[PDB]
Amino acid sequence: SGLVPRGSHMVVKVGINGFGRIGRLAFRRIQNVEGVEVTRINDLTDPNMLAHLLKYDTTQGRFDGTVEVKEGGFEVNGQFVKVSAEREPANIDWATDGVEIVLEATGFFASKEKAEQHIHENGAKKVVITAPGGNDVKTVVFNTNHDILDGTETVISGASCTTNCLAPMAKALQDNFGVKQGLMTTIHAYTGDQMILDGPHRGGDLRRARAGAANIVPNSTGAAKAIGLVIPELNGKLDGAAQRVPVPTGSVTELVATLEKDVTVEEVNAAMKAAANDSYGYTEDPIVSSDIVGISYGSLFDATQTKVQTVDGNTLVKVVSWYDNEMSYTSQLVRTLEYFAKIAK
Amino acid sequence: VVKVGINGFGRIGRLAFRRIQNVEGVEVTRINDLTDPNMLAHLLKYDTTQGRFDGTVEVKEGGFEVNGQFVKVSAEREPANIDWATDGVEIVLEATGFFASKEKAEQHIHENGAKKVVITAPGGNDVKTVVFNTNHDILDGTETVISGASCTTNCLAPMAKALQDNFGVKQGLMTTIHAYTGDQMILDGPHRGGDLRRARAGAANIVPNSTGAAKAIGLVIPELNGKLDGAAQRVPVPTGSVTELVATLEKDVTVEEVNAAMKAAANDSYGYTEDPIVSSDIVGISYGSLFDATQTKVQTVDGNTLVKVVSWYDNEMSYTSQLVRTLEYFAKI
Amino acid sequence: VVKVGINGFGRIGRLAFRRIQNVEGVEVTRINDLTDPNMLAHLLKYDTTQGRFDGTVEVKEGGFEVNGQFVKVSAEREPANIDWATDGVEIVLEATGFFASKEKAEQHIHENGAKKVVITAPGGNDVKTVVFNTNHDILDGTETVISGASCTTNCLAPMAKALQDNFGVKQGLMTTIHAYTGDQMILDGPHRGGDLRRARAGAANIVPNSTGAAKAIGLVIPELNGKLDGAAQRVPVPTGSVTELVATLEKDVTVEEVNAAMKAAANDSYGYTEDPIVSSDIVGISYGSLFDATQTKVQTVDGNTLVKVVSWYDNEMSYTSQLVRTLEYFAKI
Amino acid sequence: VVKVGINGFGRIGRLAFRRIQNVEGVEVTRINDLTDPNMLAHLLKYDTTQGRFDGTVEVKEGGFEVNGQFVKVSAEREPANIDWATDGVEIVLEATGFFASKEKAEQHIHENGAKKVVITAPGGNDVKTVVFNTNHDILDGTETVISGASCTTNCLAPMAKALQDNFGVKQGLMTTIHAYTGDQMILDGPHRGGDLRRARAGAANIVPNSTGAAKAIGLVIPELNGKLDGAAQRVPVPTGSVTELVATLEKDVTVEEVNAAMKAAANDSYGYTEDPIVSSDIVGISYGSLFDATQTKVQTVDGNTLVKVVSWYDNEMSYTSQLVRTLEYFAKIA
Ligand SMILES: NC(=O)c1ccc[n+]([C@@H]2O[C@H](COP(=O)([O-])OP(=O)(O)OC[C@H]3O[C@@H](n4cnc5c(N)ncnc54)[C@H](O)[C@@H]3O)[C@@H](O)[C@H]2O)c1
Ligand SMILES: NC(=O)c1ccc[n+]([C@@H]2O[C@H](COP(=O)([O-])OP(=O)(O)OC[C@H]3O[C@@H](n4cnc5c(N)ncnc54)[C@H](O)[C@@H]3O)[C@@H](O)[C@H]2O)c1
Ligand SMILES: NC(=O)c1ccc[n+]([C@@H]2O[C@H](COP(=O)([O-])OP(=O)(O)OC[C@H]3O[C@@H](n4cnc5c(N)ncnc54)[C@H](O)[C@@H]3O)[C@@H](O)[C@H]2O)c1
Ligand SMILES: NC(=O)c1ccc[n+]([C@@H]2O[C@H](COP(=O)([O-])OP(=O)(O)OC[C@H]3O[C@@H](n4cnc5c(N)ncnc54)[C@H](O)[C@@H]3O)[C@@H](O)[C@H]2O)c1
Ligand SMILES: [Mg+2]
Numbered sequence A: 001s002g003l004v005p006r007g008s009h010m011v012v013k014v015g016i017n018g019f020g021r022i023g024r025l026a027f028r029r030i031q032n033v034e035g036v037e038v039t040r041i042n043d044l045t046d047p048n049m050l051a052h053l054l055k056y057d058t059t060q061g062r063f064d065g066t067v068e069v070k071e072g073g074f075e076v077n078g079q080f081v082k083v084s085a086e087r088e089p090a091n092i093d094w095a096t097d098g099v100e101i102v103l104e105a106t107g108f109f110a111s112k113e114k115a116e117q118h119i120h121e122n123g124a125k126k127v128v129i130t131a132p133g134g135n136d137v138k139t140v141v142f143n144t145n146h147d148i149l150d151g152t153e154t155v156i157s158g159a160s161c162t163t164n165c166l167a168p169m170a171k172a173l174q175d176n177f178g179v180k181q182g183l184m185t186t187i188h189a190y191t192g193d194q195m196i197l198d199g200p201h202r203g204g205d206l207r208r209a210r211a212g213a214a215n216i217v218p219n220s221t222g223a224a225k226a227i228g229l230v231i232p233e234l235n236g237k238l239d240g241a242a243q244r245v246p247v248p249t250g251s252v253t254e255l256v257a258t259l260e261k262d263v264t265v266e267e268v269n270a271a272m273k274a275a276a277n278d279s280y281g282y283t284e285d286p287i288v289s290s291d292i293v294g295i296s297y298g299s300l301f302d303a304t305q306t307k308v309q310t311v312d313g314n315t316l317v318k319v320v321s322w323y324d325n326e327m328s329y330t331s332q333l334v335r336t337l338e339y340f341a342k343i344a345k
Numbered sequence B, C: 001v002v003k004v005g006i007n008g009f010g011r012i013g014r015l016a017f018r019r020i021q022n023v024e025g026v027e028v029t030r031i032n033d034l035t036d037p038n039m040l041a042h043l044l045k046y047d048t049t050q051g052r053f054d055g056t057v058e059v060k061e062g063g064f065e066v067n068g069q070f071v072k073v074s075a076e077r078e079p080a081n082i083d084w085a086t087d088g089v090e091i092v093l094e095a096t097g098f099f100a101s102k103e104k105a106e107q108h109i110h111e112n113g114a115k116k117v118v119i120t121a122p123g124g125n126d127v128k129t130v131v132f133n134t135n136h137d138i139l140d141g142t143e144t145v146i147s148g149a150s151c152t153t154n155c156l157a158p159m160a161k162a163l164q165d166n167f168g169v170k171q172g173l174m175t176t177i178h179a180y181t182g183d184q185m186i187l188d189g190p191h192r193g194g195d196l197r198r199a200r201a202g203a204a205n206i207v208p209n210s211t212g213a214a215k216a217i218g219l220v221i222p223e224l225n226g227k228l229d230g231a232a233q234r235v236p237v238p239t240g241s242v243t244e245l246v247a248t249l250e251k252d253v254t255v256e257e258v259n260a261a262m263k264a265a266a267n268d269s270y271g272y273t274e275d276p277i278v279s280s281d282i283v284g285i286s287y288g289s290l291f292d293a294t295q296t297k298v299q300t301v302d303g304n305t306l307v308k309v310v311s312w313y314d315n316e317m318s319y320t321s322q323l324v325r326t327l328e329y330f331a332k333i
Numbered sequence D: 001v002v003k004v005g006i007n008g009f010g011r012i013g014r015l016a017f018r019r020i021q022n023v024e025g026v027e028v029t030r031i032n033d034l035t036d037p038n039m040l041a042h043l044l045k046y047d048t049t050q051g052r053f054d055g056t057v058e059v060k061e062g063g064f065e066v067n068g069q070f071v072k073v074s075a076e077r078e079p080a081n082i083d084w085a086t087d088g089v090e091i092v093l094e095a096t097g098f099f100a101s102k103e104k105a106e107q108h109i110h111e112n113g114a115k116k117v118v119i120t121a122p123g124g125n126d127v128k129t130v131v132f133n134t135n136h137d138i139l140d141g142t143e144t145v146i147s148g149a150s151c152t153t154n155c156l157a158p159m160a161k162a163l164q165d166n167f168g169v170k171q172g173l174m175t176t177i178h179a180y181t182g183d184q185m186i187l188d189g190p191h192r193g194g195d196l197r198r199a200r201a202g203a204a205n206i207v208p209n210s211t212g213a214a215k216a217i218g219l220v221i222p223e224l225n226g227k228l229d230g231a232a233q234r235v236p237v238p239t240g241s242v243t244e245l246v247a248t249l250e251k252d253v254t255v256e257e258v259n260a261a262m263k264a265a266a267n268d269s270y271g272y273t274e275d276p277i278v279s280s281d282i283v284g285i286s287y288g289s290l291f292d293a294t295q296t297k298v299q300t301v302d303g304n305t306l307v308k309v310v311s312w313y314d315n316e317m318s319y320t321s322q323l324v325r326t327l328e329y330f331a332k333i334a
């Protein structure tokens, strides 16, 4: 390569738009990254609300450090972070606080055209969307395809929680055995786009309208359909859907697939274990969803759930991987942000 | 047959619609919310806590049919711009949660508008606040805006009134252990009202919060003005609540006398039970308040007594039943 | 009028009793469990997920009255020691979960005992396994012990049969997203069956677990023997479940053709819907299985196709409705 | 370094084990339950509400290794038959819930048995009942069987003691809004103890139930004997609870005086906060009781005052922290 990455001693200043579940957890992880520092947060509320929500967290625990509210922001372990309440990305003066890269984590500007509103005079230089960002934006799952970045990009995508879970599992199947086709079901924690109790859903979804913590709720997901953005050779081969269920975080992805090469359960499991790294984990323990809350793997393969069914010479393969849709995704997002910040030019 | 409109087809609005189906002399001809007819029709048909709709619902142009009868749906954000009179609407159920004052609710009353408004919530001290079968006799029919009180007030009032009439209340403190509601966040996030506790995941926490029901009880029971205060603990059930009152009394009492007084005060609004029930057993009940004799305490220490009385309520259907009883009576006069 | 005995007045036993109140030719005259009549009467009257009993229940000496009719209650731990014949009982619903085999269920059949038994669960390969309206024609009336199968089998069977009859099934894999059940721990603790996942808090986790419904489908639909396998993900709802099947077929299909085949297969046991429902909408239904056309997929890649079909079931009431249909039919022949 | 045994490797037993890993003078060499080592090792490693175990756990013949150190596991149903002395065990944490009395807990003490027992629950009126940093001074070290009280008692005691010492309590009523526990049914079914409310689905209901914490407060704070009574509302959180006390006092007070008195009473056992927290924020805390100044009320009507004071507790880890403090102290002076 010729990427001439900055050292982690060269601290890149970052902005967060949307201090929500992903925004706040990203902020937490950035405290333990040497070369990245958050100097500006933009949301729709006062500093006290945001400071309180950083300090206390229902699913991810108390903040590791001190948080203290101040005029126009709050201090985190002594260091001041500016807070603003600007509804339009175009009006945020990111350059005032030295911000080069924005984490776009509101859920309202997840496209090239909308995210580009952050890039203007007195604005930011680059934007990382914390969600799928359309087919014209480079979409990175860290340790699967982050080598597609050269640092000249203005808008990139960190993909979805489900994509970060599925990608290394699907890639391992492809590289070892060849994937012909497959169908995915993710059994997913409820999220902030569902209603706490039955009521009109602003996006017109009749199922997200329903009480999220009291129902099994079917819903759509693009993670299988858009896997070609991450793994080109799987383009058009996967499709899927979700069943959202009453846990506040923690999810699992099942993939049923046909393969080119013949396999046994043992060979499938061995292939996953050999593909394991900081992003893709491996376990043979019979765990449940609470055991993956707060993990740093993007995807945790569960060898206890593997199936290989051969009937009349035709085989279906089932592979299953866990993910904390909050912290698993956030860990991948911050790995990508850190890498992008180093090569940004 | 008085024609009614519903502003805010939410939990209270939809359940009020359901109950109005079995009340002759009241009929809903117009619904106003912020969404399309297909969304509202689906939410009427299917209900997580209150069950499937008893009847047929079918989406049409600009509304939906309920058992063959068309109801118009509009999506007007401002009360002033709703043409209620077009559909014959005299009385409006103001059930959005955003216009719970005399000035704001009066916006429904204009040319091509409505005549009267019932606020499905506390509406201030200058609006008559009615708990049915406790103080609905204060209505004369000339009022423009009235309040149906809160869910907690409809629970508390008959229980507090029975203690006052029989034994006299000196003072008391109330705790309501309450179902989570739509004003809490599904997961931890910024609360638009500035509440740091309603900001938290409502179905995953015991969440302390404020309530005005005990402090404002004087609007319903004048003789208890200034005598009660309280608070709430919101907990992970999607509907169904309970109110505890700890009080000092003028007269000496026993557990049996307290329970007997409640039984004697029982009616369509105020129920009585000695069964050891739990919250799921009161989901969908028609009582505004269900006294539970199994939870009564009378503690006497060194001549001084504290009395504990407890009543169940479905914050949804118990309140809605009361609301529709008041609507029916108000429309008649 | 055939007289029925219930062993194990649990979730299935109590709901079977409830359904039998609306079946004219059948009557429960004896209940056996491990507790006193007051506990059982209370648990009949009040039900967290299925609502208040539609009737009166009053505790008496050695049992309870349901709408004035006495039902005898015993607490006999061993099936061989229950004197079923005393109360005219000919057929026993074996619903404890502890006697789900031919040899164990046969203990009910003795002198002063019952004549026949229906196990409310899988009961082994030497017991006829019946899903009503899929294979109840295998019964001739001479059987002593039969099986009503599982909840998942009653969901999966009509959906799989419809695929087979119309298109021909080659193979398939099943996932059921299932309500937690009484065999899971309320909080993390030692599981008596040795299951490390059922040991975990059932209402606070997604819990993978095994199921035999797909593997044993050959007992119900012979032509699908050895063709299906599956597993479960148990999740935090107290009742209500859904079965997804991904399959390969002999004929080429479209989404529209698959949905049309299910609609044509629909009967009292197998329902059809195009409404975008969620799990609470199927609690208390009478269908054994409710096909959801909104979740169908037909994926064709390089000439090869996978088909996904999904059906809802209330693991409690859907199963119980099938069980009582089979019980009635088995009693009449 | 005193060697300890655990009878009942349940919620309290397992969390007690976890805390003992960070106590220098105490060490667990024997666990007794009703299951195989693989089940117990798995339940130690993975915990729904309290998180993954900080350390390595590996199953072996007849037990498991924790960071390379072997701990013996047995499955003896009767306390009389457990040979505690074989593994050097002097003090036993009795955490099954089935032997919470002097007579039943004494069964552990025999030849080849243990010397002393700490019951992780109320143990009756004839056993010394200790809330650490409230009345652990009543121990002299000669006792055979002691009690660590209940979760609610450990919450209530320092709050009630602070009111008594500063202002004087006449009487009071307590409501604890409590997490569901292992003695409730997961779904509606026959309750073996005959309780018609604990028979109901614990994670789907508000469930009224009895508690003895207020009535038996005299065992911990003698001067409050016969002055308090209460009850519980069990609700759908898997751990985390809160205790409300409404009381009449001898002295007149303000909200500020009441809060200041609690802050002055604060220590490792009794915490103080002014932050508007919720139950998830107290899961895993080491305070036995955490006073919440945001919920205090002082209502005066016609010269007569009622005072409301509220404290949080993680019925699991708050109680366990107090239990291990008392165990450590009791072992030191034995
Ligand atoms: N939660 C997950 O599991 C998860 C996983 C991966 C990706 N994501 C994606 O991350 C994004 C955020 O998800 P979340 O769960 O954190 O949502 P959230 O609702 O918790 O956070 C959204 C935040 O954005 C703020 N906001 C909304 N509109 C704004 C505006 N115009 N300007 C500034 N701030 C605004 C809100 O006040 C809130 O704090 C979405 O794109 C989502 O799809 C979420
Ligand atoms: N839910 C309860 O337990 C309960 C009990 C008693 C009283 N209340 C009161 O009833 C009211 C409604 O509560 P809810 O739980 O039904 O709330 P909800 O959120 O379920 O219903 C609110 C409805 O109003 C609509 N709406 C919002 N703004 C609007 C506008 N400008 N114009 C038109 N429609 C608009 C929303 O789309 C929604 O359908 C509140 O005042 C509440 O305090 C609720
Ligand atoms: N709940 C479901 O979703 C469901 C669905 C289909 C099939 N089943 C099957 O039905 C059976 C019962 O399941 P459930 O959910 O009703 O369980 P449950 O625990 O609710 O009911 C079991 C009942 O049997 C009683 N019992 C136990 N041992 C007994 C004995 N020796 N003698 C008499 N009574 C005894 C218990 O006291 C209890 O009342 C099981 O075989 C289960 O697999 C359950
Ligand atoms: N859980 C709480 O919130 C809490 C709080 C304070 C005190 N306590 C007390 O702690 C005790 C245990 O409560 P828990 O919640 O940990 O219960 P639990 O059900 O989680 O633990 C009980 C354990 O004891 C084992 N056991 C049962 N009978 C046994 C026997 N005869 N011999 C050996 N082991 C046996 C069981 O297998 C199980 O592992 C009770 O006395 C309870 O009142 C509990
Ligand atoms: Mg940093």
Ligand SMILES: [Mg+2]
Binding pocket: B020, B021, B022, B023, B024, B025, B026, B027, B028
């Ligand atoms: Mg009518």
Ligand SMILES: [Mg+2]
Binding pocket: C020, C021, C022, C023, C024, C025, C026, C027
């Ligand atoms: Mg009948």
Ligand SMILES: [Mg+2]
Binding pocket: D020, D021, D022, D023, D024, D025, D026, D027, D028
């Ligand atoms: Mg130690």
